[PDB]
Amino acid sequence: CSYTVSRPVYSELAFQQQRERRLPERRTLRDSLARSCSCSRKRAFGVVKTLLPILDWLPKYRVKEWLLSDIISGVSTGLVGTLQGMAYALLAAVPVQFGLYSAFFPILTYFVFGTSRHISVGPFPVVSLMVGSVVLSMAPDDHFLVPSGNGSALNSTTLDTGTRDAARVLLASTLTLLVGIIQLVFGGLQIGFIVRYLADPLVGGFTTAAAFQVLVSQLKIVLNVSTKNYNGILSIIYTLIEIFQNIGDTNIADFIAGLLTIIVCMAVKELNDRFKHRIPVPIPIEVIVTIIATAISYGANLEKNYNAGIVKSIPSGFLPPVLPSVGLFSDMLAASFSIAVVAYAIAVSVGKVYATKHDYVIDGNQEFIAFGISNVFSGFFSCFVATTALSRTAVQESTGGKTQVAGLISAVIVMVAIVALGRLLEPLQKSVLAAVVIANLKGMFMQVCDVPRLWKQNKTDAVIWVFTCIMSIILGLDLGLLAGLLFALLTVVLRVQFPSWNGLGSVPSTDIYKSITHYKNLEEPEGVKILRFSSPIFYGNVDGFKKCINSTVGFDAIRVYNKRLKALRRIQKLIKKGPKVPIHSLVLDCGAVSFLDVVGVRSLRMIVKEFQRIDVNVYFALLQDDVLEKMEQCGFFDDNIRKDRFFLTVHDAILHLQNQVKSRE
Residue ranges in 602-621 that form contacts with a second copy under rule CB under 8 A: 602, 606
Give the shortest CB-1-to-a second copy separation in angstroms.
5
Backbone φ and ψ of 549, nearest 5°: -65, -45
| Residues 517/530, Cβ–Cβ less than 8 Å | no
| Residues 79/413, Cβ–Cβ less than 8 Å | yes
Cβ count near 651 (within 10 Å): 17
Give the shortest CB-177-to-Cl ion separation in angstroms.
24
The nearer residue to a second copy, 242 or 363, going by C-beta atoms, is 363
Give the shortest CB-428-to-Cl ion separation in angstroms.
19
Residue 440: which of a second copy, Cl ion, none does it interact with, CB under 5 to 8 A by kind? Answer: Cl ion
Task: Report the Cα 412 to chain-centroid distance in Å.
Answer: 34
| Residues 86/122, Cβ–Cβ less than 8 Å | no
Query: Which region among 149-157, 231-239, 240-248, 354-362 touches a second copy (by CB under 8 A)?
Result: 354-362
Residue 594, interface with a second copy (CB under 8 A)? yes
Residues 436-475 within binding reach of Cl ion (CB under 5 A): 440
Q: Using DSSP bridges, classify how beta strands 387-388 and 617-620 pair: parallel, antiparallel or unpaired.
A: unpaired
Cα angle 235-241-247, degrees, rounded to a multiple of 5: 130
Distance CA 418, CA 430 (A): 18
In the list 74, 114, 427, 499, the residue contacting a second copy (rule: CB under 8 A) is: 499
The nearer residue to a second copy, 543 or 644, going by C-beta atoms, is 543
The nearer residue to a second copy, 143 or 459, going by C-beta atoms, is 459
Q: Collect all residues with Cβ–Cβ distance below 8 Å to 101 and sequence separation of at least 6.
A: 381, 382, 383, 418
Residues 412-441 within binding reach of Cl ion (CB under 5 A): 440
Quickly list DSSP for 334-392: HHHHHHHHHHHHHHHHHHHHHHHTTT----HHHHHHHHHHHHHHHHTTT----EE-HHH
In the list 107, 175, 389, 557, the residue contacting Cl ion (rule: CB under 5 A) is: 389
Residue 115, interface with a second copy (CB under 8 A)? no
| Residues 26/661, Cβ–Cβ less than 8 Å | no
Residue 543: which of a second copy, Cl ion, none does it interact with, CB under 5 to 8 A by kind? Answer: a second copy
Distance CA 134, CA 140 (A): 10
Residue 507, interface with a second copy (CB under 8 A)? yes
Residue 50: which of a second copy, Cl ion, none does it interact with, CB under 5 to 8 A by kind? Answer: none
In the list 11, 391, 541, 603, the residue contacting Cl ion (rule: CB under 5 A) is: 391
Residue 544, interface with a second copy (CB under 8 A)? yes
Give the shortest CB-366-to-a second copy separation in angstroms.
14
Residue 637, interface with a second copy (CB under 8 A)? no
Give the shortest CB-37-to-a second copy separation in angstroms.
18
Residue 391: which of Cl ion, a second copy, none does it interact with, CB under 5 to 8 A by kind? Answer: Cl ion
Query: Which region among 152-160, 190-198, 385-393, 458-466 touches Cl ion (by CB under 5 A)?
Result: 385-393
In the list 496, 548, 641, 661, the residue contacting a second copy (rule: CB under 8 A) is: 496
In the list 146, 561, 580, 612, the residue contacting a second copy (rule: CB under 8 A) is: 561
Cα separation of the two ends of the chain: 40
How far CA 589 is from CA of 180, 359, 361, 524, 623, in Å, comes to 50, 44, 42, 14, 8
Residue closest to Cl ion, measured at CB: 389
Give the shortest CB-509-to-a second copy separation in angstroms.
8
Residue 318, interface with a second copy (CB under 8 A)? no
Task: Tell me how many residues contact Cl ion (CB under 5 A).
Answer: 3
Q: How much is the CA Rg of the chain, to the nearest whole Å?
A: 34
Q: Helix 478-497 crosses helix 459-474 at what angle (to 10 degrees)? A: 150
Residues 415-454: x where in contact with a second copy by CB under 8 A, - otherwise, as a string: ---------------------------------------x
Residue 307, interface with a second copy (CB under 8 A)? no
In the list 534, 550, 612, 617, the residue contacting a second copy (rule: CB under 8 A) is: 534
Q: Where does the chain break, by residue before each gap (C–N > 2.5 Å)? A: 578
Give the shortest CB-170-to-a second copy separation in angstroms.
31
* 3-state class (DSSP) for residue 523: strand
Dihedral over alpha carbons 6, 9, 15, 18 (to 10 degrees): -60
Residue 633: which of a second copy, Cl ion, none does it interact with, CB under 5 to 8 A by kind? Answer: a second copy
Dihedral sign for Cα 238, 240, 246, 250, please.
positive
In the list 540, 584, 637, 643, the residue contacting a second copy (rule: CB under 8 A) is: 540
The nearer residue to a second copy, 526 or 626, going by C-beta atoms, is 626
Residues 597-636 within binding reach of Cl ion (CB under 5 A): none
Task: Report the Cα 32 to chain-centroid distance in Å.
Answer: 35
